């Protein structure tokens, strides 16, 4: 998945998240977190959104 144009508007359980990668506001529309799902696919998420932060550092630990 290249860039993000729309964010997911539905919170995902961390149990369904394998890993994340960031994307930046350069050469690409909006800064976003891209979650790698337990089911292969990637979801765009809003880094300003709260559940995204908590998912990110849960994944880190």
């Amino acid at each position, epitope marked *: 998945v290249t860039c993000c144009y729309n964010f997911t508007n*539905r*919170k995902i*359980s961390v*149990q*369904r998240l394998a890993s994340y990668r960031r994307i930046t506001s350069s050469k690409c529309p909006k800064e976003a977190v891209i979650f790698k799902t337990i*089911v292969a*696919k990637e979801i765009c998420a809003d880094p300003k959104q709260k559940w995204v932060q908590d998912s990110m550092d849960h994944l880190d630990k």
Partner: antibody
Amino acid sequence: VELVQSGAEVKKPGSSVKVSCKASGGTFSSYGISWVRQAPGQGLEWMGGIIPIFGTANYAQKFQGRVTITADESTSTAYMELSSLRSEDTAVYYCARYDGIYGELDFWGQGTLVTVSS
Amino acid sequence: EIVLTQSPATLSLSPGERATLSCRASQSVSDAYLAWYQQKPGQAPRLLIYDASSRATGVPARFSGSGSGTDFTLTISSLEPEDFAVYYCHQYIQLHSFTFGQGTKVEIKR
């Protein structure tokens, strides 16, 4: 999103039944198919589900040794074979779509009646 | 392994009254991964509420769900007679083991 199931079956006790569910798309590259039954006047029982890009299904333990759930990518059809049939298997069998990353059964097939009797 | 217990078994209310249905779980359901279905006589179940509190697609405004952990409630604010149905709760946090509540019947009182 339509889920079109095969027609009603009649089976002798001890045999097996294979129910099909054709999903509108070729789009179980993003979703899975659940099988849920309901004996007359009874509640909903999960039986198992498959997310096709996993190649293998998960089963509810009440049916564990008796059920096989498969999926064929080319025809976008999911299947549910239940063997060693008893009268308690007399039920309406539904297929239902779900998202692996969530799980709510958002779209349902019309159901297949399976009647198990002598 | 998560057992859902719905109460009451049957709910009798006159039209316009408020309906409150319960789904208590034997374990904490982890990210509000709980759903409500409506089933009218001789019809396929219809999704009403997902994520415990999100009203589904083409669902009338009088239907609402809420709660988290083990205590979940479905609310029909002003009961319509076309709401005579059985309502089911469903956890989907355990992908490998989906479970359903035994169902609550909502009936019109006259």
